[PDB]
Amino acid sequence: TYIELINIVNDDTPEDDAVISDLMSQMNDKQTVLDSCRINHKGNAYFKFHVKGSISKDKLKALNETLKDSNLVVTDASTQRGFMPPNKFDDITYTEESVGYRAMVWTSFTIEKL
């Protein structure tokens, strides 16, 4: 029925703690960090990570407080509804490498030095 169908989507979508856990895994994986590395206009370096699910404002603040211990903050976290492009791309255009479905919930994190 209708309620079950929307529960499937909202149950497939991971919750805040799972989103943070997956973000930490991507930050620990060396190749993913390299793929997410971006050089800013000042010669600085920021990292962009694509993580399935969404994080609420209350736990994003908790995430930033956790990251401060590492001199990192999340300057942006945008909740997209669409396909997840690989971390080596900056754009959300659908390619043969994209994972997901057209209404998938996922977040694009921008992590910068404190």
Added chain:
Amino acid sequence: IEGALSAVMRPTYRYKELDLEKVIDTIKSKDRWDDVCAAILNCVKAELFP
């Protein structure tokens, strides 16, 4: 709301954030300038006509 015309039209406001990093495919696109122009105008047109 303030403004004399509020009495003869339906007050209308729309806010949309456009991130060129996510829209523009900088790796493969041959003409980045045109893609930026299209992204901005497509954002405006999509919201303005309705």
Added chain:
Amino acid sequence: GHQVTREIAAIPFNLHVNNIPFALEFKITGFQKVMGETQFNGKLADL
């Protein structure tokens, strides 16, 4: 109380009034990301 000055001051007397409660507001960012490339200025260092 100790120095006299010829103070020729201009006092703006005007008002900006909005007539039509209609606007579409867009926030467009990322131009420097998609219209330019940063040069390899040596290695990445935190200073």
